[PDB]
Amino acid sequence: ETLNGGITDMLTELANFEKNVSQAIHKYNAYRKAASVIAKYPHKIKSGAEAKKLPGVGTKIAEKIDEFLATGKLRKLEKIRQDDTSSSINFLTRVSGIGPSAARKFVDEGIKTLEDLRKNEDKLNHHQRIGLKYFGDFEKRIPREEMLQMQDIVLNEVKKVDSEYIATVCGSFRRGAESSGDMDVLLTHPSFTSKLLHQVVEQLQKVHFITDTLLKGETKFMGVCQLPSKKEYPHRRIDIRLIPKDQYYCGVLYFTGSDIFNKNMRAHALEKGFTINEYTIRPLGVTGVAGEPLPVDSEKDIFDYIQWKYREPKDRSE
DNA sequence: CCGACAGCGCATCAGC
DNA sequence: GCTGATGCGC
DNA sequence: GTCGG
Ligand code: NA
Ligand code: NA
């Protein structure tokens, strides 16, 4: 963190500007990817040319690094920070439900601060009101100890609805992370293959675990939950996905991550003669044509098809 | 030089 | 009202 | 913004 922290903070701040103000999502992911590869770089960068050797860092970023290492700042960023419009737009996107488009809309109307939002809740949809209500709590990290407690509640209540259910808490948590930003739960049932989600949500609301709802459909749920007290715990964001039984363990593998791990596994699968997405793993023909989905009854089955040794979730960082 | 870069599920918006 | 586009989260 | 056809 003390190695190239100044560079990674710069690229991250540049990433947010492109996403929120410029609305250039591909430039946003470009800076983050660069900020990521520099973070894992075990040396203190001395020049843009050194970082240029890394994948994801091109000419423009190398040029920016050179300026930062010589001046301690970036003229582009300093002018962006002092810009009233850009800073206000970039900040409002921190509210869940407010993206680049809505933030641009609000700032143009004069709505630039968190207080201005509260004075204009008639201009906000349901999601934005909830995001505003739990603004502070949503930016808080969820310690693993609390994630375990949340997991106990979810697994207990899901089983009380129907013992035939299968629930898996994925994300960085399943990889053994010390903290999380949210809770992603994958759900399935033998009767559902390629009104089960409602019953689970209702039960979690019955024990007052789920407090609010952002979106709710037949296969996907996003809302707000909170751990019971005896100091009251912060409200956390929870997502619950209903996945078909024949596509469940492919989904588990997908949402467990990491993003880099999935990229490598998809690459290794292609060399073995298989293709893997979020839903299914299919064999490839001699002309590149994919066949019918392969039977998956376990996460270890997918590793067996591609002749790969089973990777523990804790060892899926890359 | 120039397109890819993940894209799906849900809520809301724009047009008919 | 329906249908498709847009916006947003992940 | 970077990478690769
Ligand atoms: Na490079
Ligand atoms: Na937001």
Neighbour-count burial of A133, counting CB atoms closer than 10 A to its CB (0-12 exposed, 13-18 middle, 19+ buried): middle
CA A228 to chain centre: 25
Q: What is the DSSP letter of A124?
A: S
A148: tokens are: 């375990």
Angstrom resolution of this structure: 2.5
Q: Does residue A175 have a known ligand-binding role?
A: yes
Domain ranges of chain A: 1-83, 84-140, 141-254, 255-317
Closest among A246, A250, A165, A247 to A204, alpha carbons compared: A165
CB–CB of A155/A232 below 8 Å? no
- Whether A141-254 and A1-83 are alike in CATH topology: the answer is no
- Containing H/E element for A152? helix A144-161
Q: In this complex, which protein residues place their C-beta within 7 A of any atom belonging to strand D?
A: A 26-27, 29-31, 34, 54-62
Domain A141-254: CATH superfamily is Beta Polymerase, domain 2 (3.30.460.10)
Domain covering A84-140 assigned CATH 1.10.150.20 in the classification? yes
Residues of A identified as active-site: 64
Identify any residues that bridge with A153 across adjacent strands, giving them in sequence order.
none
Q: Does residue A184 have a known ligand-binding role?
A: yes
Using the mean position of ligand 2's atoms as its centre, give its distance from the Cα of residue A111 in Å.
15
A55 CA – D3 C1', rounded, Å: 9
Closest ligand by atom to A60 CA: 1
Q: How far apart are CA A156 and CA A151, in angstroms?
A: 8
Using the mean position of ligand 1's atoms as its centre, give its distance from the Cα of residue A49 in Å.
9
Using the mean position of ligand 2's atoms as its centre, give its distance from the Cα of residue A117 in Å.
13
Closest among A100, A89, A105, A98 to A135, alpha carbons compared: A98
Q: How far apart are CA A278 and CA A194, in angstroms?
A: 14
- The β-bridge relationship of strands A236-242 and A183-188 is parallel
* Residue-by-residue DSSP string for A227-285: -----PPPPEEEEEEE--GGGHHHHHHHHH--HHHHHHHHHHHHHHTEEE-SS-EEEB-
What CATH class does A1-83 carry? Answer: mainly alpha
Q: How far apart are CA A185 and CA A139, in angstroms?
A: 20
